[PDB]
Design a protein around this ligand. Sequence first.
Ligand SMILES: Nc1ncnc2c1ncn2[C@@H]1O[C@H](COP(=O)(O)OP(=O)(O)OP(=O)(O)O)[C@@H](O)[C@H]1O
Ligand SMILES: Nc1ncnc2c1ncn2[C@@H]1O[C@H](COP(=O)(O)OP(=O)(O)O)[C@@H](O)[C@H]1O
Lengths: 571, 114, 179, 493, 195, 150
Amino acid sequence: NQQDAQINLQAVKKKYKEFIRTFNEENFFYKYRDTLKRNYLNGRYFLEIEMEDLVGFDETLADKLNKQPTEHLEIFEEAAREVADEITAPRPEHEEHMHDIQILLSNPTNIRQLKSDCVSKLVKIAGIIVAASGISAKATRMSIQCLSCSTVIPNLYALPRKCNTEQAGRPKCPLDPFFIMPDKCKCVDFQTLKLQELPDFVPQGEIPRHLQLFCDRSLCERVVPGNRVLIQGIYSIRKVGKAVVGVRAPYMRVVGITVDSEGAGAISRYTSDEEEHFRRMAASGDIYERLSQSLAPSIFGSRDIKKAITCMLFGGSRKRLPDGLCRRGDINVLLLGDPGTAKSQLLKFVEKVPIAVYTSGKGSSTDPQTRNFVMEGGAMVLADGGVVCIDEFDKMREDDRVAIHEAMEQQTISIAKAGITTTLNSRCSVLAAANSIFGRWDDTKGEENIDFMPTILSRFDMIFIVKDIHDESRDITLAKHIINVHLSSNKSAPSEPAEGEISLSTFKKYIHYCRTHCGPRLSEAPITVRQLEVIRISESLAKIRLQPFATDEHVNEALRLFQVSTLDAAM
Amino acid sequence: FTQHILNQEESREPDDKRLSPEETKFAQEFASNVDEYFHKVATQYMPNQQRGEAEQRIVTPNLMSHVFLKANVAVPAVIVGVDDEEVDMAAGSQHIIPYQLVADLIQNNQAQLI
Amino acid sequence: MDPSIIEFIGEKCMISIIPNFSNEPLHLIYGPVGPFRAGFPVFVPLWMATHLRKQQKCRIVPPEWMDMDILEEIKEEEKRSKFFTKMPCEHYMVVAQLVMSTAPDDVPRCEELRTVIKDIFDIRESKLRTSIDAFIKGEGTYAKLDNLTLLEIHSVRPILPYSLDHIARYQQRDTSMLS
Amino acid sequence: EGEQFIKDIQREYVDFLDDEEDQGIYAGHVKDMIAEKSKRLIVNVNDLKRKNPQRALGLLSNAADEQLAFGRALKEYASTVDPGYAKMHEDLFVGFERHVTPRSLTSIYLGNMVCVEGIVTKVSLIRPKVVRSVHYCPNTRKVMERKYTDLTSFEAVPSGAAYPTKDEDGNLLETEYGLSVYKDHQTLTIQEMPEKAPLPRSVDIVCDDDLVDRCKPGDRVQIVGSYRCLPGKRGTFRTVLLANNISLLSKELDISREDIMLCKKLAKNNDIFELLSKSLAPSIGHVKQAILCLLLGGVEKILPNGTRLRGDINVLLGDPSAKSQLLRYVLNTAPRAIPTTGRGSSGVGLTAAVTTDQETGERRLEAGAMVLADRGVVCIDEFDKMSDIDRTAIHEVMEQGRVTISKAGIHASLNARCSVLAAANPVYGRYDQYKTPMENIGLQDSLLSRFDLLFVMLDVIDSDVDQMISDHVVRMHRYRNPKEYEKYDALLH
Amino acid sequence: MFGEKAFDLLKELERSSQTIPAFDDDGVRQVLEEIKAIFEENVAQASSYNASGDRSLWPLLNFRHAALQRNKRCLLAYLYERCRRIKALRWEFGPIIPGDIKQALCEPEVTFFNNYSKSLAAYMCSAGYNQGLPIDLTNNLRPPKSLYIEVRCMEDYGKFELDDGEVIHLKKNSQHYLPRAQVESLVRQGILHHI
Amino acid sequence: PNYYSIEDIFVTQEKVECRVNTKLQRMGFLDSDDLEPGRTVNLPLWYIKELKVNNAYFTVAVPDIYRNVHKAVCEAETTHIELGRLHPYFYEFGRYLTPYDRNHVIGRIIFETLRQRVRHLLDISDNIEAKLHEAGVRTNSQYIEWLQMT
DNA sequence: CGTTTTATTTTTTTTTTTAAA
Ligand SMILES: Nc1ncnc2c1ncn2[C@@H]1O[C@H](COP(=O)(O)OP(=O)(O)OP(=O)(O)O)[C@@H](O)[C@H]1O
Ligand SMILES: Nc1ncnc2c1ncn2[C@@H]1O[C@H](COP(=O)(O)OP(=O)(O)O)[C@@H](O)[C@H]1O
């Protein structure tokens, strides 16, 4: 109790506690005080605070606090418990027992700026998460048979010479009869967190550097990779010294990160006016052919045939049976043709317009730490509800072309590198893109576009080819569909003014209601076995007209779209 | 409670103490609106046996408003009318109940409400 | 059950205040009040000081339970509150609102005041979660008012009873139970 | 002997021993005359908590010490009733029957007997460990004794050290063995069932003698355990969960001698061929009658003091596009019978020279894929395309059904009774006799009796069967549906 | 199906929540024209000696009753549900300002409307005085000031102000030389940030 | 005619498949003039809400979640059992049901679950609990301004 | 007549070996 300065107590003595009990303005709302109450709505055992409210009281703690928070934040812990435990009952008549807590703080900086000077010090910076480990273990105390004292620890030595199997007369017991007894112990968490620097601070001629992090109790299970963070930590150490002389320890820990809310993407992890938006357009029975000029909302293609998408994104219905089979609710569609038609950028947009990945061939596609063989998996990762559209089928190795035959016609998945069998499946699908042989002159004739199999042309449906067909009338138009489309690089906003050819995000959630209600069906009702086996698109229209049911031949609208394809394999 | 309150009124013709006239003119206003709007809901082939102001309709036979008691009477255990336990009354404390059982003290205004 | 339902009520209470002008353009409003003389305190209901302090007319100092030491002793008096405790006017949690709103522009120490009273209010209500963890077994005929105050019971008034009804459907037959 | 409640706690389990549940149901003539001798009784917590709920908590906050106690009460009970099942004086552990993800063991449940479900994997080495020391004093010839302990059993350890000698005086001091007993110990780890995953986080467990590898890596289970961690972090920490029972979920049977009596009585209905042929795949004309034996494996034959003949059958047939949505209704239902990828190796039955895994390895990845179907069956696609290397490795099998390779790996022989199917594609379509049967496929006829049939699968779209195809295939497509959820029961027909 | 259809009625009030441009009378039409059509379903064996009153039409007599049952009480609701929010605005105004539309008036709804407006008449005769005054309950509880200064609002709509004014154009800046006698109508239906 | 209900077409329409002691005659809606003693006979309630429970037509029977097999341990597992929204009418099936099946055993169970809420909603600071839950939040949310204008 | 013991992992180049239309 050296009360001249640096006192051991003042904070928990009267001060920080009383600051808490002074954080008080009227309405009877201005509190740092009932916060934890509504934390106690569940037993959260934490609380958030600022770095510029102490300054609202003083100028003396701010500098004294930020220096040795390794002490102050546990002073604050003690203040917290010894204040809050008053609250379990006004007078002595309710308590199971107290418990443990947390306190959480809140100008940014970078990684290439902080060094030997910036040690034992609190900081604000911002980065981008990479990956990190699991949740293992840590305690605060336990004890030993030999003396049975709660093994008090400074920091989250090994019982020197005193044994305490000792006072039995003489008979002695040197050199540690200390069997650590964890049944008496305490317990904490861990994650060991991770960051990458910005894409703005010279990783180009140089290398992008980074460092490791360290967490404690409740702040794991909070953060996963592909996110963007702001933080406060400590520049602290793990090694010792005086390594040709003394090279040593980087890391940090956490105190109180603050993460980002980047705009409009993250309806991913953490309204009914929009339903009124949704439904009064579908009240109009003008969506089937209206949104045949929407899926390419700003450029030309598939125009009168884009109606055939209405079945696929909603899909049919994975109509299980009493018998064995789980039918092909997944169903596949095709494109194929030459470049120049905007076929590269169109599907580029389609990733923007549910969830997938997009490139073609060899570019997805068949650690030095804690001796566990990780395996991140296969191709249902982003596609089990997500579906894809990709080029270069034959333009790909044939080792990773068995899987497609297992993936696709059935999702007949399995594993054989080690000895265990992933029995995976998915509600997924693909489209194909192309630059294979000779296009429209090929499609009418026979069957050699792919130079290995007749299988393909097996379990696929509509054959809609991409061409740059000579049409002198349309030559000038697409000679003029292309300049200001490119030039001024301007086609952003005025596509959304359409009736229902609009509002990509609204469309995303239109759809993620539309299919996402139930397994609707149909009504009672050249016409071959495979073309037939389109019955799944008989099912489709009840999500397209949003019916329960429909009959055969009003939805043979698609047959007018498919007979276009049949000319390829007419005879 | 337009529904069965008329039972109470045809039981007792409740005097100036209990009810009031204009309330009973709501009987007029009720049957008028209900039956003359029902006149276009289902009156084309309206009911066959339960054709009048129907049998099954009631708002609140539950005398069961479970109620806090303003203790402002004899601080000794003045034991009075209630169908649950009535032991140990006093001017501060209470033995909480529903309305069904004390229609007595507040007709006396012996007891009180919070 | 409302914020101003009490304020239809609690400000009806009347206390000695100061007026600093005498009787008004009229002399006295008939009623318990007597007419007004500057430098001469007068007891009134408290829904005028609105029209004095906001009107920049006169001051007021409070009752005596509205001070430090008495409440810095009741803070330990309620140790007995295994039922309830001392009750200084039974509405010191509502009057203090409008008191401490505009009065303490000139009053001494509106703060330790504020501190203790919030330090008393919720803590008496912790009793009212805890003592409810004693409540079992259809105890309609068990309850607690003995020194309850005014301002609290509304905060449970709407909820449990409109639960406890369709409990109380169950709170003659054979060996099984009935509702 | 801590805080003296211990005996009272023992009494409360002994107080389990009075009336109809104990007196009628529980033990004595519930294990011992059914003659298993395995210490482990099934506990059911809801009863113990119905008696001594405080003692239902006595575990759930401190399960460090319920164990010597439980065993004590048990030996008292079994030791004061049966003198036969009593010369095994050890702990004689018991059942102890919160399921959280192996990802949600979060600092806590310490001291708690709680549940997690997951994968058996990394099933590992087995090694016993030592309980007591039956030491002798051969000059004075007194069989004295020294018990031992570990944290993995209780809290404490003895001076865990070398089996002692020359301790008293330097007299004749030596061990005695066959009596200093030992305890079968096993180690493995568990993973979450992967479908829930968005790196999925694992757990580590440790076992004992009656708990020893009830299933295999490639199976999955519900398993219940306590928690500890011994090491002293910063004077790191790393944990393990333990004190276990066993269960299992991915099996298949309330079948005493009633269900056999059920199965006999319906025998005599003579044309079960009808029923059992129309059973799994009414979602498909056509075969199912013929499928019978690929499920049944086959029959066993042994000559006295000689050799045998392999028993099971192998056949497959067809026009392109019912053949990939067909090889089913048994792949799911048949016990542990596995088809394979279609064009697969590194695991039909080869070593695959790739020594970039553990820096050594002779048999370190020598195995196949049909011995997982030993006494099962297999199918595949893409045979019509598959390599001819291990076609060699078939001709051994369909002839023999035992695998006998020794390309320096080892001189193998290993039982297998397995059957397997194939693929097809007509390299020219609709020609079966106008051209010929054979080699419209790109195939080989050396395998005459290797498979047990020459059979055929055919089609043409038609004019006369046109509406037949329509009306039946759609009869299916709407008898697919209810009243003929998203789909109720399809009744009629 | 047998009236699962009030679940459909729930969205008829969607924009018409506290920003009500106009409301719609719909969801009802053949929903009504079925009900006495299926009186034939209800009448079919009605006092018929087809079975002479025996087992096989007891169970669905109850259906005939159930069909009735769900009919009437949703028919309580179909305007009663509409009479509640009505009552709020209809306490927010006496007969000063009835509905903005009167376009989804279930045609004899005036039957209930006026009668409901006249159930207050009981209260009215007693309210204000024994003879009664249609009494201020909901609007302009300014401690009232002098009569003749103009107005500002917050985009009221309907323009249904029947009170003695030349033309006010009852929106924000309904602003003309407006006495108190006019402006005694409305408060919280899109109006009164300000004077 | 009711302590009314929002889903008067899902109020007494949840369905059970009780067996049969005796013969049948002409169901009408079903695939039906005579059927067996003992059959999975789908039975949406309302007609049998007062249909002579004592009579030799149907038997002791339960949809077995409502049988003791779940619930009689959900009274021991009355600790952190979750219900979600599943079998929804689960404070209230028995308000009709409990004697009507005439297994004389489950009246205790539902009370035994829901009188727990005398010590569930201390930490609070089905299709029926929704109302009071909303209210519990609401009253405190406005007690907020019972402090002040806040 | 006292006071102290003990751990290493990944990549090269050779000589072996092994892969597809
Ligand atoms: N008689 C039938 N019974 C059941 N399904 C049939 C029948 N005839 C045709 N079908 C359907 O026609 C489809 C034919 O395509 P299928 O998936 O069988 O291709 P495939 O035969 O596997 O192709 P490949 O053998 O070349 O790989 C099957 O999905 C099947 O459901
Ligand atoms: N009708 C069109 N509308 C807009 N852009 C087009 C059109 N036809 C061709 N293009 C151009 O073609 C380019 C894409 O060509 P691409 O499909 O990549 O060729 P390839 O398939 O050979 O790679 C786009 O940048 C786009 O500007």
